[PDB]
Amino acid sequence: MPKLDLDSIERRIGSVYPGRLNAAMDGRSSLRLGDAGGLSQFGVNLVRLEPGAKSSLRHYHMEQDEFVMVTEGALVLVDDQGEHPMVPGDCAAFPAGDPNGHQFVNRTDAPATFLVVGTRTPTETAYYSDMDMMVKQDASGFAFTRKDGSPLTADQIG
Amino acid sequence: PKLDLDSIERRIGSVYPGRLNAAMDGRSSLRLGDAGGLSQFGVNLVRLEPGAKSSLRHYHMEQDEFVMVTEGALVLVDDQGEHPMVPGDCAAFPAGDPNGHQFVNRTDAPATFLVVGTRTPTETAYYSDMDMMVKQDASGFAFTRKDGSPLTADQIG
Ligand SMILES: C[As](C)(=O)[O-]
Numbered sequence: 317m318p319k320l321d322l323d324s325i326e327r328r329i330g331s332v333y334p335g336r337l338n339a340a341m342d343g344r345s346s347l348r349l350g351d352a353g354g355l356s357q358f359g360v361n362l363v364r365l366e367p368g369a370k371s372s373l374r375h376y377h378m379e380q381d382e383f384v385m386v387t388e389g390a391l392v393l394v395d396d397q398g399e400h401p402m403v404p405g406d407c408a409a410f411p412a413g414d415p416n417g418h419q420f421v422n423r424t425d426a427p428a429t430f431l432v433v434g435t436r437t438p439t440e441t442a443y444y445s446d447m448d449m450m451v452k453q454d455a456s457g458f459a460f461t462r463k464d465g466s467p468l469t470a471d472q473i474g
Numbered sequence: 475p476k477l478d479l480d481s482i483e484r485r486i487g488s489v490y491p492g493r494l495n496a497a498m499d500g501r502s503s504l505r506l507g508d509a510g511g512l513s514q515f516g517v518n519l520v521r522l523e524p525g526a527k528s529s530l531r532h533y534h535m536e537q538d539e540f541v542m543v544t545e546g547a548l549v550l551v552d553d554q555g556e557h558p559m560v561p562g563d564c565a566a567f568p569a570g571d572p573n574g575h576q577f578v579n580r581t582d583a584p585a586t587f588l589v590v591g592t593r594t595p596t597e598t599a600y601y602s603d604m605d606m607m608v609k610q611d612a613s614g615f616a617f618t619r620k621d622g623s624p625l626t627a628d629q630i631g
Pocket residue numbers: 332372373375442451458
């Protein structure tokens with residue numbers, strides 16, 4: 317049965333961010349549509365942002381292409397060029413390696429949802445625009461460090 | 475990074491051979507992934523006029539595929555038969571799973587869907603409803619019977 321049942325898919329909350337940063341994703345939840353569907357080459361997540369919530373800390377990927385479509389509510393795409401409003405049907409593309417850190421923020425008083433597609437790759441590196449952090453992802457998970465590879469500090473993550 | 479859908483070229487027609495070419499009358503699409511500079515997967519927004527179909531019923535060997543209906547109502551046709559699909563409904567087709575699929579617009583209203591497909595150097599698609607397959611690569615693509623011999627007059631006119 318290729319047709320997915322969204323009401324059955326587990327709703328995920330929280331984040332992999334370290335220390336105080338985990339709290340930054342309060343109001344973000346998601347359904348992993350790709351995994352539910354048995355796909356392995358890319359991920360597909362339907363992400364829901366409560367009022368005030370954000371999709372991620374502002375970043376860009378080195379290895380994975382990313383595509384987003386807003387499905388409901390209204391969002392703000394924040395990148396190097398500033399704020400870009402996004403309504404339902406609006407789409408954004410983030411080519412792997414393009415050093416323009418991006419995030420979506422819900423500044424409205426209603427929930428907003430968006431579809432995000434990202435290539436699955438054995439390894440990944442993301443750089444965070446707004447602070448001295450980067451992450452290295454492999455099959456075992458995520459290693460967050462400063463941009464020089466040294467550990468994140470208490471001053472940084474509590 | 476924000477795409478302008480009114481600016482992207484609307485594509486029509488099909489690469490299907492002979493009489494099958496016209497089978498995709500009423501199908502048009504916007505290549506969103508190319509528009510956006512993406513290389514690792516394709517994203518197409520496909521519009522089906524009433525009666526139109528997404529493709530001849532088929533499955534991919536090498537590429538994963540994902541679909542969400544964005545507007546209107548469609549029918550997903552696969553081995554198990556007909557499955558109605560309304561806006562927000564999604565379907566996933568893992569590479570290699572031999573369950574051929576197509577979308578058909580049996581309403582009187584246009585319907586649109588988003589399709590994502592992995593880009594790979596080579597691909598094979600088998601067609602479920604007739605003796606045909608297609609092999610693709612960098613060099614190009616070729617429609618043949620499933621045994622690799624040429625499609626016949628009896629088959630494609
Ligand atoms: C761990 As991330 C690339 O969603 O900030």
